[PDB]
């Protein structure tokens, strides 16, 4: 939400994308296809796996504590025994609720950020050869076959090869 | 013309709802439960030394109630006391029972060291039909019931130095006879007095003759007291009657030991975390099984589910 | 030429300062207070059952001090004890007063069940000019002051089985006479002894003859003790003199009840949260009125204001 | 702050904007006007209303606790009674201070994000027909009357209608 | 052709690893330690009033053990008790020692106000070779050991009104003689009884004749009791023998005072925070020196290091 | 990380930049040079100095508490004394660990944001006179001497002076 990519300018997700979290769909002179982007997918997964490990660290080896159930009514000392533990459980319950609320907020924002970073990375490569249609797609203003799509996906696209063709197509009447 | 290149993210048809700062329920592609809410229902015997109390409370095992004789000198990481346990010896009460149970449980051992007290002038090894050991009338194994010898009970003044390097736990008692006849038939004088001293402290007790409610054949009671004697200090015992004497000391330790009330069966398995409901996994950071735990445990919280998103927002087609 | 399109956000002239991780004070367009810092100054009688102690402490109402007779068998969610309250009966003290007050307060009822004790051989219904009920010398309504009958006080041995399914709370006492003359004029023997037993426990008390400070006409005292008898157990009472006997038991409950010290008036209103300062709203998550609360309350914190931004940064023109 | 839109590249706010949180000001051949943007305004308000509700959930029904005021000096047991409650109040005071600090930080950042998302949404529509002057405004390089401004505000702007006019105006000498 | 303009950020060759939500260790350009883990090893005498107990415990200074006479009427913010301290007076024990130490420590003063008790009929200023003051057999300076006068000890009944506006702390005791001979040679009757009363409360003690372990020449003991009398109340003392009487009262205060066990030397320096290890800086929010502190201190945590990034991610060339 | 500027599209940092946190390197007809950007550097430092001050506020003057070391074994009351303090230290240890984890996450993200804001600020000034090469650099399509670089760094660059030269260079064949 914080970047407006996911659940925002990108209408919705792709249920048929089951080899990655982020990726590419194209339409060109040879047809259509779909390819996952491995780095942005791994970058998000690595961050999420990071947060899972931090929550799974604490030992909290506790051995001899206080009694927490009582079969006799006793007054003052038991009120304090009961109150201390109740105090403890409510504070941890807050910590647990807040931790999850913070982690989940950060997970949605950070997965949104990977989406935006891939868009900007792809934009920057395309230079003057494409325009952003605003719905998460680029219009590419030159013939760009499957090897060409592969070069964008691979990060080896040479914009200078196509610039003359693309600029002539962009700035028509 | 040219081409179109669209950038996108995955989605699943079966998303899961999670909470954020902003939204109590937003759908994501995947999540994992952070609250442990189940138990196997059995306490695993590994890696902790589990001692099943069976029919015996820890206190009955300490004093040496005859059906608890098998617990003599035993050790534990966790003593498991069962709700079916029964006392079956001389009726007794322990002032500040809870503290004695706690400090014995924390020591983690019932290791008992016999000492040669000088009880010349009184008889020893008193017993009762309320505390049968085999067929013979008997008594707490770790306690020595002193009574009169040739119709006299002389003022006892008995000492025991701690020349070791560890603390000694002494368990002793005071007999409260049912009647004045029994008071005098045992101890001669009509009222006795038990004083146990160290260099730092003194506990003096007076018997209270009179009938208590009928329990296992007896209207009379024993009261249990305890005294810890540090290295270089000394136990001195003074009593004009009614003394339930120690036979020696328990070696007091400190370690990772505790006690737990549970009816869960002990099983051949391994789990770091034990609760009264049974052992539980500790892969999650939080748990909802029981606030009572022992070992390496997830922290107890009120929530029964806390889901951590492990994927992005889910936006179905 | 063409046109210009500018994108912008609102601003207000009267912004509010809030705290962030970075900045103790940054201006935003709107905020809401998260700390409750006021009370109406009255305790609302709804939705909790409020029992105004008036001139009576809970303990005086339990024992049955005559000006507290109107509290007999009453119930509460919150007992409100007032600082003007006064005892006006026989001078008394309660060892571990705080615990008796706590367990009675937690039960939430003074419901008292009369029982027919067998006190044949002693007189009953002793009284004192320090505890006037109407014009007649009297005593705590729930207590039975036993004294000698035809110049003898025989050893009492009185029992009461719990054949019910609930716990019984028994309140009893020990009389400490001012002088040896009064000791013997009441109880014959020069010193008595009160023993109250169950199958699990025993409380024995000895009177201490001698003058205490002068209070409401008396240099003598009563000490209050209590005994809870579980279902299937039995109360047995043994006393050679000085016994202040129970007339029966209080039914002990457990529930959501408590006690609070407050001088706030009770009013015709509704509030889930009660403090000694008065009832407070619980719309905010935190409060600064008092650490003492009852009901559904905001959590007590040290801060007197915590403002949650409810709008964007404010950037005035 | 985290996006540099509010309290950043957008000089300041509009005190005369009292029908929304975000919106549009324009200057064209028919004059000038101002219009609120309802979706971005509601998107921010919904998020803020969300956080207010989460803070207003807990019941914390507590009934019988410990005593917290004492008229007698007692030593050990009262020290512990006093210490436990003091411990409790200091931990909640930390939780309250931190919660507000986190919430307020997130509120400013998230309201900044709505500002940026509206700018990017508007940018993407305008395609090659406008340039960002860097102060939160677009220079629109064609005649764009009030109905035209309305089409941008409404999201119905058809950039292809104006592209020839706009490109000819952008790329002059 | 033209030009190229690159935008960039700094880097350092010697970065530091910090923790985030995502990553246990990511390198940043700079960080600062948030956990205090060192002490100077000395307790600074400023800004708190530090009273070095030296060879004296607080309790020995209160009672007035002769080598502690220099502590009479002194005050403190922090009383520092040293582990080499020794008692060197009459052997004694204090039931609920910990509470007396706590309430005296919290008052922060040993200011003692002598009062003229009416002890006509008994002798005063008893002493012992176990409690030498100079060469003369003596006793606790603040206590008055009463014994028989011309071979009689009459029942004492002594009162003292609090007509002031502050609370009075009274310290008194009970003598436990070694033998019946010494009991009667001091107090005539074979057993005494000490009763100390206020309008609200009563503490009665009985001596327990008999030998305790040998300590500083004596097998006998004194037990220390205390009584606080509020304004408008009155102390009344009743004893048939064995009374160790107060000489007056300590003015009880409340303030910011406490007590600490430490062997750290006191130095000429200033630090708001004191621990048993020595004073520590409080510039950091957390500390790992000791859970025991006094003053304005960083909060104690288990971690020995917590680093707060103070610069950006470090990305070396 | 959250913006992909630092540790992302900007290959790495500059160890020779020791007069600021952010800045400029250029290559032009007169040579090459390096200059720090003072405002973005100060903006980050001010935020970091802000968070340091908030952690250095609390007094936590505590005086008379409970005992925390014991030389005698006592049972129930000491178990509770020990348990309350253990409870307290574990909760603060969580607060301290989480606070640092939150602060550090926010510090990296916020320093990343200053990097991105300077890039966008610089982009917006350059208008149609430069293109983003995607590696944190702009190709400037006109002669732009040291005074010219200074005008970009100073925020006084007048894009209209160069637009004809730059557009003619951008849109070649
Ligand atoms: C003060 O007052 C109390 C209570 O009134 C007296 O205590 C009673 O004393 C009598 C005399 O010993 C006790 O009688 C014994 O009771 C045993 C327990 O009875 C159980 O079973 C009955 C079945 O009807 C139940 O109702 C009851 O609640 C118990 O569950 C019996 O088992 C005994 O009989 C057995 O032993 C004797 C020999 O010991 C044999 O002769 C019998 O044949 C049988 O084998 C015996 O009858 C009575 O139980 C006590 N009650 C209580 C509540 O304590 C005190 O004695 C009295 N004090 C004085 C000084 O007088
Ligand atoms: C051990 O020592 C204590 C203290 O020295 C003795 O306790 C005193 O005992 C006497 C004798 O009973 C008490 O005298 C009574 O005092 C009542 C309270 O007085 C109040 O009013 C006076 C006004 O001057 C105040 O100064 C005082 O502090 C009180 O506030 C009086 O009200 C009594 O008089 C009334 O009752 C009697 C009959 O009971 C009538 O004759 C009177 O006319 C009047 O109606 C009475 O004078 C004295 O109060 C006790 N003081 C204390 C502190 O307890 C013990 O008696 C003593 N023990 C032994 C065994 O000797
Ligand atoms: C009940 O039982 C206890 C223990 O059995 C008795 O207590 C003993 O009583 C005797 C008699 O007084 C004590 O004897 C005295 O002991 C002092 C301490 O001895 C220290 O040094 C020896 C060195 O061998 C160590 O072993 C020992 O542990 C101590 O560290 C001596 O210093 C005394 O001698 C000095 O004083 C006397 C006069 O007082 C002089 O004549 C001597 O020359 C010397 O100056 C003395 O010998 C014994 O210590 C007690 N032991 C304990 C453990 O208490 C009770 O007396 C007994 N009760 C009854 C009623 O019989
Ligand atoms: C209750 O216990 C008391 C002990 O406090 C018993 O007291 C004895 O009573 C008998 C008469 O029954 C006397 O002959 C004895 O002298 C008393 N002894 C003492 C030490 O006082 C009493 O007997 C018990 N109750 C009953 C009913 O037996
Ligand atoms: C573990 O045991 C505890 C207590 O033995 C269970 O908590 C009880 O839950 C029932 C309702 O299911 C309540 O009526 C009881 O009052 C609870 N007990 C207490 C002491 O509060 C708990 O549900 C068990 N958990 C599992 C997973 O079996
Ligand atoms: C949902 O997420 C979970 C946890 O993030 C994933 O399952 C984990 O897979 C990892 C390897 O990626 C293994 O180490 C563990 O076996 C799993 N851990 C947990 C806690 O489940 C997985 O990506 C998703 N699981 C499902 C069933 O969809
Ligand atoms: C203080 O209380 C004691 C009780 O412990 C009273 O003791 C009596 O004293 C009188 C003489 O005044 C003797 O004749 C009695 O034999 C004592 N009784 C006992 C049981 O010992 C004493 O009287 C009280 N003090 C005063 C001044 O009366
Ligand atoms: C609610 O009552 C408490 C105590 O009755 C008030 O706290 C007192 O505040 C004054 C100063 O205004 C201090 O002098 C007292 O010492 C405080 N009492 C205690 C026990 O600390 C509190 O201010 C009241 N709140 C309201 C809103 O009336
Ligand atoms: C400032 O913000 C508050 C709270 O966010 C707003 O007032 C709330 O208005 C909502 C409806 O939007 C109502 O449900 C409540 O009556 C109000 N709640 C609270 C807690 O005040 C409003 O936007 C602003 N208020 C003012 C006075 O400017
Ligand atoms: C232990 O202490 C008791 C006190 O409870 C002492 O009892 C005395 O013993 C002597 C015989 O040695 C008798 O003559 C006295 O009558 C007893 N006094 C009392 C009050 O009962 C006993 O002496 C001490 N032990 C030793 C060995 O002396
Ligand atoms: C401050 O003192 C405490 C205790 O005096 C030190 O903690 C001890 O650390 C050693 C190991 O170095 C352990 O063996 C002890 O058991 C610890 N004591 C306790 C009571 O747990 C602590 O290390 C000291 N800190 C400094 C900086 O000197
Ligand atoms: C690393 O960061 C620290 C703390 O952020 C800096 O040192 C501080 O410098 C400020 C002035 O900027 C002074 O007020 C203090 O003397 C320092 N405080 C602390 C806590 O160190 C500095 O930027 C860096 N320090 C080093 C040694 O590189
Ligand atoms: C892109 O890379 C993948 C894997 O590295 C390879 O299979 C594919 O042939 C490459 N395509 C192009 C156009 O380089
Ligand atoms: C969705 O279904 C798959 C297939 O059974 C399952 O493995 C996965 O855990 C499910 N995910 C959720 C979030 O329910
Ligand atoms: C416990 O006692 C009962 C009855 O005697 C029986 O179930 C079991 O054998 C006893 N337990 C042990 C360990 O002997
Ligand atoms: C600003 O003034 C208006 C008008 O009285 C008021 O309703 C609003 O609450 C004020 N806001 C702040 C933040 O003071
Ligand atoms: C409390 O006592 C005083 C004086 O008798 C009086 O104000 C009031 O009537 C009493 N309260 C009740 C409820 O009777
Ligand atoms: C834009 O929408 C609003 C409300 O939906 C409407 O009043 C207005 O006429 C529309 N303008 C245009 C140009 O479509
Ligand atoms: C890096 O080295 C400098 C020079 O000695 C030093 O001042 C600085 O503190 C060091 N920084 C880190 C993070 O180690
Ligand atoms: C403490 O006692 C020892 C031995 O007498 C000695 O080191 C020192 O002088 C004493 N301390 C004081 C303050 O007198
Ligand atoms: C830019 O500003 C700096 C300092 O304000 C100044 O030294 C420099 O000469 C300026 N350069 C230009 C080209 O304005």
Residue numbers in the entry:
A (entry chain B), D (entry chain B), F (entry chain B): 1 to 173
B (entry chain A), C (entry chain A), E (entry chain A): 9 to 325
Copy text verbatim from the article accompanying this structure deposition.
Interestingly, from the late 1970s through to the early 1990s (strains Bgk/79 to Shn/93), a marked decreased in binding to N-linked and biantennary O-glycans containing only one or two LacNAc repeats beneath the terminal sialoside is evident. Co-complex structures of H3s from the 1990s onwards reveal an interesting pattern of redistribution of H-bonds around the terminal sialic acid moiety. While our observations surrounding the amino acid at residue 159 are consistent and predictive of H3 receptor binding preferences by glycan length, it is clear from structural data that evolution through the late 1980s to 1990s is complex and encompasses residues within the canonical secondary structure features that make up the RBS. The alteration in receptor binding conformation shown in Figures 5C – G is principally contributed by HA variation in the 130- and 220-loops making new H-bonds with galactose and sialic acid. Residues 190 and 193 no longer make H-bonds around the O9 of sialic acid and the second GlcNAc, adapting instead to make new interactions along the sugar chain and giving rise to a slight structural shift in the overall positioning of the 190-helix. Firstly, between 1968 and 2000, enhanced binding to longer receptors evolved by spreading binding interactions along the length of the receptor sugar chain, rather than concentrating mainly on the terminal sialic acid moiety or terminal sugar linkage.
